[PDB]
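Summary for the steering committee. The consortium agreed at its last meeting that each partner would contribute one worked example illustrating the joint modelling workflow. Our contribution is presented below. We chose a case with several input lines so that the handling of multiple components could be demonstrated. No manual editing was applied between input and output; the record is shown as generated.
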Amino acid sequence: AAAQVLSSVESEIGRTTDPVRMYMREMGTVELLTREGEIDIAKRIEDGINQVQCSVAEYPEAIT
Amino acid sequence: ETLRVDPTNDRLSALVEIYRMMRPGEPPTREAAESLFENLFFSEDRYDLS
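What follows is the complete predicted structure of the assembly.
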């Protein structure tokens, strides 16, 4: 858990101001996920637009 | 007397607090802690008496 640790750190940021710390210590939370993250996220995206284009057809009002 | 004031016990959280002081706002990470310490006072790279 990083939000569990961001809890304490943000509780006691030693009056730090640099958004470098903020952004990097935020984006360090979520790690790498690829090599099937890539393909399953891909299959999910293409399934999204697949069900879109499925939805598109049978058009009573969108006559053009 | 100072030991009696010391709240700390182990190498690890000691080094955590050192790490913290010199890198405020940063979470505790072991490797970076011992790396920092070893850079500062026993590394030939970044410390020289001449």
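Chain B has three helices and no strands. The two ends of chain B are 36 Å apart (CA to CA).
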